[PDB]
Design a protein around this nucleic acid. Sequence first.
RNA 1: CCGAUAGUGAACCAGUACCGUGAGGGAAAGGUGAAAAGCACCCCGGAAGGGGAGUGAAACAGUUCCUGAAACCGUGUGCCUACAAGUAGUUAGAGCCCGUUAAUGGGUGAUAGCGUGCCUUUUGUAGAAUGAACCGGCGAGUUACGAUUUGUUGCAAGGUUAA
RNA 2: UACUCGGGAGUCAGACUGCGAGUGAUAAGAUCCGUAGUCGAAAGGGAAACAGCCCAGACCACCAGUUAAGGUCCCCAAAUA
RNA 3: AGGUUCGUGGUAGGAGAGCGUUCUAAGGGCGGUGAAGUCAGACCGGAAGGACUGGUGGAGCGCUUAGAAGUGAGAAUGCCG
Lengths: 116, 142, 101, 53, 110, 47
Amino acid sequence: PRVKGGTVTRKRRKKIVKLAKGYYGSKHLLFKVANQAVMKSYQYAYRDRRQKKRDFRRLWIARINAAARMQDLSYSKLMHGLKLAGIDINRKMLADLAVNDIASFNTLADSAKKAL
Amino acid sequence: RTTYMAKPGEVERKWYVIDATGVSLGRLSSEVASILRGKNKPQFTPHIDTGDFVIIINAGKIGLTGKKATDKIYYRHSQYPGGLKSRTAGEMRTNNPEKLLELSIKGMLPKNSLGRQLFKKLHVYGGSEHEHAAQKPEVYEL
Amino acid sequence: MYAIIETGGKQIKVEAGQEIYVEKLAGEVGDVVTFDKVLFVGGDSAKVGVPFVDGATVTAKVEKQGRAKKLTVYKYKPKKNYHKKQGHRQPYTKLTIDAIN
Amino acid sequence: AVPFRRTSKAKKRKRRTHVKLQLPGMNECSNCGEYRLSHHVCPECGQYDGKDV
Amino acid sequence: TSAKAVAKTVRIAPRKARIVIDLIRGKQVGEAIAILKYTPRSASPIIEKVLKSAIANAEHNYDLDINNLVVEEAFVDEGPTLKRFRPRAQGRASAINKRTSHITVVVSEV
Amino acid sequence: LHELKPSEGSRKERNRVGRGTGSGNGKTSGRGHKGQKARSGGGVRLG
RNA sequence: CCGAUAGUGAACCAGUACCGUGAGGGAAAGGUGAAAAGCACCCCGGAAGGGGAGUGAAACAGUUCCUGAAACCGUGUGCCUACAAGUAGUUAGAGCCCGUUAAUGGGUGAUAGCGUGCCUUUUGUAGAAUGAACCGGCGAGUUACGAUUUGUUGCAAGGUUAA
RNA sequence: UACUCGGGAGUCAGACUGCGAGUGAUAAGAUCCGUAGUCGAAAGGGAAACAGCCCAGACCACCAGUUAAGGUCCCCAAAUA
RNA sequence: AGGUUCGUGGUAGGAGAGCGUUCUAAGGGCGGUGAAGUCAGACCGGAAGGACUGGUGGAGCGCUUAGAAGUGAGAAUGCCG
Ligand SMILES: [Mg+2]
Ligand SMILES: [Mg+2]
Ligand SMILES: [Mg+2]
Ligand SMILES: [Mg+2]
Ligand SMILES: [Mg+2]
Ligand SMILES: [Mg+2]
Ligand SMILES: [Mg+2]
Ligand SMILES: [Mg+2]
Ligand SMILES: [Mg+2]
Ligand SMILES: [Mg+2]
Ligand SMILES: [Mg+2]
Ligand SMILES: [Mg+2]
Ligand SMILES: [Mg+2]
Ligand SMILES: [Mg+2]
Ligand SMILES: [Mg+2]
Ligand SMILES: [Mg+2]
Ligand SMILES: [Mg+2]
Ligand SMILES: [Mg+2]
Ligand SMILES: [Mg+2]
Ligand SMILES: [Mg+2]
Ligand SMILES: [Mg+2]
Ligand SMILES: [Mg+2]
Ligand SMILES: [Mg+2]
Ligand SMILES: [Mg+2]
Ligand SMILES: [Mg+2]
Ligand SMILES: [Mg+2]
Ligand SMILES: [Mg+2]
Ligand SMILES: [Mg+2]
Ligand SMILES: [Mg+2]
Ligand SMILES: [Mg+2]
Ligand SMILES: [Mg+2]
Ligand SMILES: [Mg+2]
Ligand SMILES: [Mg+2]
Ligand SMILES: [Mg+2]
Ligand SMILES: [Mg+2]
Ligand SMILES: [Mg+2]
Ligand SMILES: [Mg+2]
Ligand SMILES: [Mg+2]
Ligand SMILES: [Mg+2]
Ligand SMILES: [Mg+2]
Ligand SMILES: [Mg+2]
Ligand SMILES: [Zn+2]
């Protein structure tokens, strides 16, 4: 028997074109450039799921540095002192504590300073 | 998840006066750029302006070491055939200290819209008086 | 009064009555979960653990066991005829905080 | 001599910003109350300057 | 509340009719008729007849006040195209599009 | 007749080449690149 | 076995229209409704074309008339945009506007980080090497008869029929 | 792991870097061998950018930690040690 | 069925398991109280893919187990519109 190619091509291509909503001009209208744009977006998302974590760690470190300089310290000295004292609070918690509850940050800075 | 991000106009910005007598151009420039960016506060957010305003006085007495007064050169091109112009650092210090400080500070700020915004918070004077007494600036020591 | 606790290979700051999403734990909906790896208790008196505060616990109640919103992972290499597609659905546990002891 | 790239819709719409046309300089006739061009004879009554033409 | 009129498959290119239809939109009907009368384009008579037809059937079918109407919306749409040819040099022929248009005008009060 | 099942391992599914690269037999269909043996009707005698 | 780009070149006044001095080459083009009941009459207009009224289950079935995708052309509007250097996204993220197959929801996005299309052919291509204006349909390892190897089933020193 | 027997292949244009030679001028991102590596067919980090150099091999997710080469005045994370 | 250990970059290429399309046979169904097709959605599966709800449409179509193929297009200065 004969199989004519109806109703599957349109379904697949329409799914791809809808995945490209919001792109500029032809990139949200035409299948051939939408397909390329969708592939590029997937690749970019894959790489940025790796870059996001290291960007957030950079931000936390810079904030902790600024908070510790007001207590007559550096980030490097403070981290070494907190290691020497057996304190295992990570960058996320320390930066959160610096912005929001600076008194506990100063407490931990005193503890590190005594450890040195 | 849950990390702090500052909003525009949220963090209160201060006014500072810095005396430029006898300090090397690059050392003062590094410190002032760090202040303008806002990296001395724990509320630093990379996409928001959280820094302060800086006034510099006595810019005619900035220091240059070595033979930088006669041997360091600043260049301009007008984009016309052969239109390159040259100017030494010492005679700018004599004639346009504000341009010298502005060029040095600008070279070490980020190159985007936000950096051009931050450049506008710097005021430089070659003498010892400024025009911003209504802003009540505060003395800041390097 | 709040605490910093260690769970799921990371650390979280916790208050009473707060809803929390963490990596999947063992427990049916409605059971009580106890965290004993408490690093810091704050509020009017700071207890700093080295690395843990002694005898301190936090108790919570299980609200749901779920899988997060679907994600598509796609890779390709140009001019090498190489593509790969995959789906991901990360499981989680939702809890509410009963008490900080 | 020949277009290197095809023109997008936005670029064509930007170029067509000034290809509109203006609005006629007309006002009402003091005699018959109809619309007419300034400095022109009224086509509905044949008047100009308050006289028959 | 509203009345409309359409002219279908009018032998005039849609761009040349749109350029005139643009400056009638949202105007009082008497002012719009005056505007169409004094614009020296070839699309003005066609649009004038469509607009007067809309005013007339508003008055007749819906008993509306013919002295308080405004042009609610006016637009031009593409119709079918006549395909022609033009003999060029070297023995070749080039395509010609004789385009047509549908013209729609709507009137209402206030 | 609504539950026919042939003995297992007696029937296998045919392989089709040139049907996309996710199957492993896509573009060149298992032939390699640019030779006498890559052509239609190509190849040499038995010996 | 095909189902209107298929099946005859030809489902329709087809070896016709058209091209060529000639021998010769050689198309496109199916579908109102169960029934013409195929819109009396009024209104604008020279007409074409409309708006009512009427027929019908349906007129958004009105004599290229079942359905009616995409390219492409328009009208309206929620968010953004006139100091900015952009393979046009992605990650972070205010502000504004909504309210779903109800779930760590939807639209748009000031600003910040990162980021040189797809294919072919190559030692090596973002390549200033090749191909594609865009959208749609069509378009490439098959069948017959032999050989060999693997799997399965029947019988087994036997097994098996051809015409 | 090795070997033996059987079914199915693709490959026969290679490149650079270090070391040992020829040719060349003790030239060449030259040419031709031997030996090891990487690319080819390998993303990630560092050399500003930069197949072949240095570090190191991506099953998926996380707003967790420690290190390598390279770095710690500002652009730009970390010592104006 | 459960453990323990070691693994899971990849071109040419080898091996395996599947998705979807048209038709046939049997079983069992849906459908004018609205089939296929078409449009739109914030749903489900590891992928190819599969449902549910509403609009349009106006008469046919799924599911299960097997069988057979004119069997899946983004590129051919491809053919036709
Ligand atoms: Mg869209
Ligand atoms: Mg957008
Ligand atoms: Mg990472
Ligand atoms: Mg310089
Ligand atoms: Mg490519
Ligand atoms: Mg079979
Ligand atoms: Mg198979
Ligand atoms: Mg058809
Ligand atoms: Mg009929
Ligand atoms: Mg009929
Ligand atoms: Mg008349
Ligand atoms: Mg008529
Ligand atoms: Mg319809
Ligand atoms: Mg119909
Ligand atoms: Mg339509
Ligand atoms: Mg359409
Ligand atoms: Mg708008
Ligand atoms: Mg400027
Ligand atoms: Mg938002
Ligand atoms: Mg704004
Ligand atoms: Mg070549
Ligand atoms: Mg195309
Ligand atoms: Mg080759
Ligand atoms: Mg290569
Ligand atoms: Mg690299
Ligand atoms: Mg020192
Ligand atoms: Mg299988
Ligand atoms: Mg399908
Ligand atoms: Mg049946
Ligand atoms: Mg559909
Ligand atoms: Mg659809
Ligand atoms: Mg849809
Ligand atoms: Mg209907
Ligand atoms: Mg078979
Ligand atoms: Mg078939
Ligand atoms: Mg076919
Ligand atoms: Mg394809
Ligand atoms: Mg061809
Ligand atoms: Mg073509
Ligand atoms: Mg056609
Ligand atoms: Mg064509
Ligand atoms: Zn008059």
